[PDB]
Design a binder for this molecule. Sequence first.
Ligand SMILES: Nc1ncnc2c1ncn2[C@@H]1O[C@H](COP(=O)(O)OP(=O)(O)O)[C@@H](O)[C@H]1O
Ligand SMILES: Nc1ncnc2c1ncn2[C@@H]1O[C@H](COP(=O)(O)OP(=O)(O)O)[C@@H](O)[C@H]1O
Ligand SMILES: Nc1ncnc2c1ncn2[C@@H]1O[C@H](COP(=O)(O)OP(=O)(O)O)[C@@H](O)[C@H]1O
Ligand SMILES: Nc1ncnc2c1ncn2[C@@H]1O[C@H](COP(=O)(O)OP(=O)(O)O)[C@@H](O)[C@H]1O
Lengths: 49, 325, 357, 157, 616, 307, 37
Amino acid sequence: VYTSGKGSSAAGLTASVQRDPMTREFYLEGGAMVLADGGVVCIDEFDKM
Amino acid sequence: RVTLQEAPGTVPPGRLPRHREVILLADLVDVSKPGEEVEVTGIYKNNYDGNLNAKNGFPVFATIIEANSIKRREVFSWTEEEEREFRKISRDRGIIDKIISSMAPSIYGHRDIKTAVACSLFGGVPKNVNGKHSIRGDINVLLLGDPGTAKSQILKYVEKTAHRAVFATGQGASAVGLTASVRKDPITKEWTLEGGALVLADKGVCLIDEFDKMNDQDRTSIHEAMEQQSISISKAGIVTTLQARCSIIAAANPNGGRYNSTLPLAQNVSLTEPILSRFDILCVVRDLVDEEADERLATFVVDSHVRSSPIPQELLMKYIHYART
Amino acid sequence: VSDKRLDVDTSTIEQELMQNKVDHNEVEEVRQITDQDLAKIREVAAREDLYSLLARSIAPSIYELEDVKKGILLQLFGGTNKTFTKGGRYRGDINILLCGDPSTSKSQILQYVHKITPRGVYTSGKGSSAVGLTAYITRDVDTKQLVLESGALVLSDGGVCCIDEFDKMSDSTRSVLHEVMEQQTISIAKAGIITTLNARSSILASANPIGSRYNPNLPVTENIDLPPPLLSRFDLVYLVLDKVDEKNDRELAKHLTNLYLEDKPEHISQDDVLPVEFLTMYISYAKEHIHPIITEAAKTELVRAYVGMRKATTRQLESMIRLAEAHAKMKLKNVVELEDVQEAVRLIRSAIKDYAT
Amino acid sequence: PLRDLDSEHVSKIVRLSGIIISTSVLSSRATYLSIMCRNCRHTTSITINNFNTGNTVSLPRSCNCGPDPYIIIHESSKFIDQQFLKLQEIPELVPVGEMPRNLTMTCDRYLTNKVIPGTRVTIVGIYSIYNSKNGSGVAIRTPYIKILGIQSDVETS
Amino acid sequence: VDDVTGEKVREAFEQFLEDFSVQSTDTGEVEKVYRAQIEFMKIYDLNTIYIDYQHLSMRENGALAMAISEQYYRFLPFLQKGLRRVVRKYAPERVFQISFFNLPTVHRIRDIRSEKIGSLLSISGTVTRTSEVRPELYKASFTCDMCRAIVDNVEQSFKYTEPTFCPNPSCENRAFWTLNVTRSRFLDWQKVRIQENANEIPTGSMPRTLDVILRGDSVERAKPGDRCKFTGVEIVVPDVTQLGLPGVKPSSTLDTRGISKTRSLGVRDLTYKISFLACHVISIGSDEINELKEMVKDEHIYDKLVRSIAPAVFGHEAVKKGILLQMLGGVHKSTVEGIKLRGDINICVVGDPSTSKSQFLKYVVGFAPRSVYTSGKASSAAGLTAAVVRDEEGGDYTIEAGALMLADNGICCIDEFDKMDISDQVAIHEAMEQQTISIAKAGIHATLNARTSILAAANPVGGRYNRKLSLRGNLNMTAPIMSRFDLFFVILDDCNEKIDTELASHIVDLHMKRDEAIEPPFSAEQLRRYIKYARTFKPILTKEARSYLVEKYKELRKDDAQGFSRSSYRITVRQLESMIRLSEAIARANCVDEITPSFIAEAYDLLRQSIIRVDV
Amino acid sequence: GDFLGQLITVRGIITRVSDVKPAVEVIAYTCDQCGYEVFQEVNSRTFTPLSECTSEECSQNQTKGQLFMSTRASKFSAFQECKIQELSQQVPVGHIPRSLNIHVNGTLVRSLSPGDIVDVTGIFLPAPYTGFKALKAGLLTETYLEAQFVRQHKKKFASFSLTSDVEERVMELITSGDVYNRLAKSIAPEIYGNLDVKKALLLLLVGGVDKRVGDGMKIRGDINVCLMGDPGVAKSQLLKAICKISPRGVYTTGKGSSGVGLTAAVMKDPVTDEMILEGGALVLADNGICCIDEFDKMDESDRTAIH
Amino acid sequence: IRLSQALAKLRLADMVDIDDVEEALRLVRVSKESLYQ
Ligand SMILES: Nc1ncnc2c1ncn2[C@@H]1O[C@H](COP(=O)(O)OP(=O)(O)O)[C@@H](O)[C@H]1O
Ligand SMILES: Nc1ncnc2c1ncn2[C@@H]1O[C@H](COP(=O)(O)OP(=O)(O)O)[C@@H](O)[C@H]1O
Ligand SMILES: Nc1ncnc2c1ncn2[C@@H]1O[C@H](COP(=O)(O)OP(=O)(O)O)[C@@H](O)[C@H]1O
Ligand SMILES: Nc1ncnc2c1ncn2[C@@H]1O[C@H](COP(=O)(O)OP(=O)(O)O)[C@@H](O)[C@H]1O
């Protein structure tokens, strides 16, 4: 997963808890790390995060 | 169904234009597009549903124009005779200059700042190296303006001429708003995905102005778009990478005065150097008062307001599409 | 509606409800006065020390600081209302900020004025917001409908709005007051209904300087904080200070350390001649049956004062002519004397004798 | 193109491509349901082989004894699964003016869970109609696509 | 008898309008009158009338007048039937609507009671939220299939059901329906919700609106954001929403004590709310042209205008012109293909408080019609834009006025731009850039035009100068909205004993009932008809002296190029563009067409001092 | 939920406890034709008002008379509902304190208040309810507690009449003499030292006498104490101490108790209506001592309230 | 005065004797003045 950020554009850069608007509850919203798990992650502007 | 409202041009002062509801059937469907004054020749009816046993007082029936026909305001493509004709025009060398001169008529502009426009608007080659990286096939024009300079109006031209051209303004916003996000729908409806200006404008031309006024949340989006040529969206459950290949044309406003310092451009304006590096062509505009230049300009402006060689606009706006395809 | 213990509403504000409520008739409304007591008022007016007298009678518990009691005394009589042909409407409104060392009773006055003034409303600093001071547009919840509620200044229209800790208001607030103080109305274009509605009200504001002892020297005009433009706008600005009179604290302690006796409060300021319920019917009477005009005599001295100050801003003049006409409103004079504008200035100069440090 | 669907495509195999916004919680429908009359004590079975969201089949009305007595027995009945995918056109193009339109899907049995939202797909299906409840009028009926079957993009991931 | 007494009132009224309605003798307007009215209405055959109340009140000594007013809802049918009678008599598709006007009295909406119910009355207020015009039955042909439709009658009062009798046949009933839309008569209508006049409301009771329904050709006569005067047709509308009010609330439980036992209970609460209705709507609230001529003839009337503008205010001479030149705007038209030029004008007054910058404002909201005044900071948001109102009910998308847009082709006056922060200022920019107001909220998308001039009063950062600071840095509003305001007309007040004495004198003068004899050369009333006349001109400069203007533009920037530490600005081309609308403004002022190079020089110097005040 | 019907005694903190209003046990109607009366008993939340007539004399007649209620004749009870939460000590290690409803009829009304720690003794009865209709298996009961008799911990002064043989309970304390030092030391003995501090805290608890100037305005009326210094010396333990001893005491901290914590919000009231002001901290504890920790970190808006 | 009047109440008082007031002064001075140690 190539993410140069700050995360982008909608995608957060890290594991994040966001709630399902319906049913409420909780779920992993997604991000670079989680979706990319068990492999390579590519980051840019790493000082700009 | 088409909600048709009174054309805002002809309004008598103080009264508001009134929604009136139109129905389309058969071949009429989907022909009309929003943001266009349309004509219908209908049969005005007070139907229906109609109960409306809810009202009660006073007895009141809604009205609906049931439409028979549609007339456009008051669809373009190249064609065999038109292209065989066409080819012979592109053969002269000076056609370039003629085109540039045709590119922004009412501004009086510059030869340079229009040249950039023509160049980026007209195209590039993508161009994928087997099988890895496509480089980029577009020209990103940073048009760095100056208060009172034409810097807005120019790009507005591009929205009329280009095939797919989108106006996102800065933010705040004039829809669309530059950031793809999955948003709950108006009234009560299921959640629809929506792209920013970038996704919407793919292969076309994305037109943005006043970078400096943009909230970082957008800035990262534009940066990403230029960088990898794709916008990724991870929310909510929907997870993708949409592909925006757009050429960005920008209008920017120097920090403070017309020319803020002898100091370098990057110092001259707020936008950070790395985002700027992505832009290949930088159009600076000037200048200090010039006698003749003020003559030449004022005559032109005055000429305009008093009113009350280049290719015909139609053939150029066909020309571009033709060649790009 | 009316009460004996608390002050009576004005006529001009009532207007129609006099001009109406007669036709279908009704009862009560405007407080009515017998004859012989009137005969007592017109007698008391004769008393020379009256202007002094009432000043001691306003706050019985509160000691000394007579010019504060006094300026406020004129806040109760404030101004004379003018409609011109149309528009005009400068009302009677006079507005007073007062600052100083803490524990100076500056809040007590607020309580008292609050108690007397018929329609007034009492607000703390930071417990306030620009939405809170007008037009809530709340859901009614009884009918499940949207109903408009009157904000705190709209209620306070007529009589006196009282304000705590005015220095401490949020920056968005105070942006309400630049509307009220000048226009004398508030203009609400928001949300559901768009109209300019009238709030005509005095303001009495308390302030605590940064010090909190505001201390000798320093620019005072700096040391009240505030934007100075807003600060110049207030009619009469009191600055209260303690000179550590020795020779005072003993006297003051004699005052406060009393009660003591009696446990059931009696003879507070005694022995001092004081009116009690008389001063309210007096004040009322003064307000409805008198409409002072300054005629010719004033204008010369009146102007030369203003220049003398200019040698400040034009508001200070507006101030003088309104504040003074209150003095003349008292004493039952339809016309101002050339005299009585003297102290009417001096009250503004009173704070200056307190600006020396 | 999802934008272009004539009313002459109704109940005909229509194939189209798009991007799935959302897939829905699984539900259960009954292919085989053994029934019993309560008063009559009579027993039967109804086996529904194919179905769209019709609703295809309802319990019978007759075992006095009546109105419809029949009690479903849940222990001997066999059920299957149903998804309700919802397909949006690719947000890229070509609304340019508007909120892009979408169609609703229904997938039975082995076509469930084949697709994660976000995966670009191309559906072969049968364009069709249900009544529902007006959110409309008059006689308007909202379209949906019964899916048989689905060939995903490869991979895409 | 009640039939007979009512019918007597009929014959009495009919005799009235047939009897002489006019005592005017010799030169006139000699008799009749109303016959002339029937016939003048017979000219264009639009079938509605206007007849005055005063006459009718005077004639019979009023027994008839009162008989009409009090029981008026009782006496509608006799009256319009009587009119139909006379029409049948003297005249040869029948729809009639009768509307009195000029009542002797005005009643405030707050002064409305239920004793005046069902009776004609007079109510004046500020119209709000007009609603699109929808048809109404009152005459319908509705019957069952069995045995025949086309029965046409009833549904008179609001119900709306149903056929009264002679069902089915032969199924005779009871039953109900069916209604045709192919056969019936409809009229009008539009609903408008009127508000209490801003100036009147009792403290602190705050305004309360009432609802007035418009049927009749009186339709569309009402206008959003306007004072109007209505005459009564008053009535009632029922309301479900009143519950937990609290009671005690009356009910319908029927008396079954007739018949016999061998329908159920049938109870329906009746809870009504008062809502006014309107037959008549007015906007209230040759010899003169000679005066107009007398105004255009003189060479000083410009100066007269300028000096006469704002009596309350003392001097400054700049903002006088600044205020008037907004009232008289440019061509605001053409140049096509293309994008349209501006047109109109803008001003933002800046200065140290106590400078009475607000008096101007109040004077403008006082003087000119189609002017909204807000004090925003409390705008709050929209405010200056439309809600839009949803629901209605019955389809909604009805639009609030409101604030800015309800003043259109006019001067909107806002105090304190510096208090409204970011949110709305952007909206204003959208108004003064795109010229259109685009509105989409959770519902029907929309575009609503507002073409307006915006007069603002903005206080400096510290409420002071800061002479040494650039004005650019002083006003503290964002750049794009800044560059659209041309030009500012900054005022600062400094002490000068002559001027000081003049102020104290003038102010004390003002607070003196005498002398209020201070008067402008033009009266506040005439200056309006004058201006409105001056608005009907289409000033156009073809003249080649426009060439001169160029050098003037040119003369302006050169000396202002160096130093840059001068008031610049630039000077922006938009200022060249500004000189145009200024010129045309002065043309509007002086009635002259194609103008003069001289007037151009006046607008020029004006801009110049507006610049120098920025220099320091 | 196996105790339903029993007479049980619980201990917990009262919260909420909405306004007392008339509820109607039986309704009286008056035929006016046959004379008589009609009394319908009324249960649960709602009822349907009867019509026609049940009169033995309006029975079997051709024409039944119509009747309508008279609110003077009917039997009303004073109804007040209050919730109690777990005492928070008794909560098992994990989880969260539960809530429970209570009803109050007749005399016991008004005896209960928020921020009270109380033993409530009542016969425990069910009342029909469930969640969303599709959420019930049936029949459930939803329950509630009924309130016979109230016994409050931390009995509440200043209200008592007597001063009968209780003075005896005072006298063991008086007779020894030197009450002031004795009590002083007796506040928070759990900590060592600072006899002066406690010496004063006794006064704080006692307070008085205020005054009324007869016009009148008031002058407090009470004492206001600060405890400075750091990091140790165990200053806050004195405050847990006091807020434990004094009734109507409430312990709060800055970040902590929000500004909306001290001020009163307007929120819709369930059952009885509507939009009642519910406060906290200062309003919640008044007529008694309020306690604050971390008094620096409270920021700004809070300090204005307390100021 | 208010502290005085408090200390009185633990005597149950109504007298408010001098040692009471003096004691109040004592508590006051002892409050602070511990910063000299
Ligand atoms: N030389 C010129 N000829 C014609 N029009 C011009 C010229 N220079 C500027 N303009 C007009 O002035 C406007 C300047 O706006 P601009 O400064 O570009 O907006 P922004 O500052 O918001 O980017 C443009 O819309 C343009 O049409
Ligand atoms: N001159 C005085 N006469 C009577 N009481 C006074 C006087 N000065 C101070 N006090 C008493 O001191 C207290 C003053 O507190 P206050 O002035 O309200 O505090 P702050 O100045 O911080 O607002 C009041 O209880 C008041 O009765
Ligand atoms: N030239 C003038 N004409 C009329 N009134 C004036 C003038 N100068 C000052 N004033 C007085 O100043 C007041 C207006 O103050 P203003 O300058 O509007 O304050 P702000 O700047 O806060 O609006 C008015 O009440 C008016 O009486
Ligand atoms: N004189 C004392 N007697 C008993 N315990 C003490 C004494 N002095 C300090 N402590 C201990 O010091 C700790 C300080 O706790 P606490 O009051 O919560 O924080 P702080 O030190 O900020 O007041 C207490 O737990 C207490 O046990």
